[PDB]
C-alpha cells in the first residue's frame, strides 16, 4: 500500500531524492531536464515538478545538511 503522499513510481522519486542529496548540488531546474531522460528508459510517469519541489520541502531545512553532509578528507 503505497502512501497518499506518493502518486507516481516510487522508484523514480527515488532517483531524484538520491541525486539531491549528492554533494554534487545539481540543478533543479536543469537536474529535472535529465530525470526526464531516466523516465524514458524506465517509463516512469514523472509528477509535475512542482510537485516535486513542494514534496523536498516536507524533508525540511536539515534536508538540506542532508545534502551538504559531505564529509571532508585530504589530509
Given at each position: 500500500?503505497?502512501?497518499?503522499?506518493?502518486?507516481?513510481?516510487?522508484?523514480?522519486?527515488?532517483?531524484?531524492?538520491?541525486?539531491?542529496?549528492r554533494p554534487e548540488k545539481?540543478?533543479?531546474?536543469?537536474?529535472?531536464?535529465?530525470?526526464?531522460?531516466?523516465?524514458?528508459?524506465?517509463?516512469?510517469?514523472?509528477?509535475?515538478?512542482?510537485?516535486?519541489?513542494?514534496?523536498?520541502?516536507?524533508?525540511?531545512?536539515?534536508?538540506?545538511?542532508?545534502c551538504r553532509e559531505g564529509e571532508?578528507?585530504?589530509?
Amino acid at each position: 500500500m503505497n502512501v497518499h503522499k506518493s502518486e507516481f513510481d516510487e522508484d523514480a522519486w527515488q532517483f531524484l531524492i538520491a541525486d539531491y542529496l549528492r554533494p554534487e548540488k545539481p540543478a533543479f531546474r536543469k537536474c529535472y531536464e535529465r530525470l526526464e531522460l531516466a523516465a524514458r528508459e524506465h517509463g516512469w510517469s514523472i509528477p509535475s515538478r512542482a510537485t516535486a519541489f513542494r514534496r523536498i520541502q516536507q524533508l525540511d531545512e536539515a534536508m538540506v545538511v542532508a545534502c551538504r553532509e559531505g564529509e571532508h578528507a585530504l589530509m
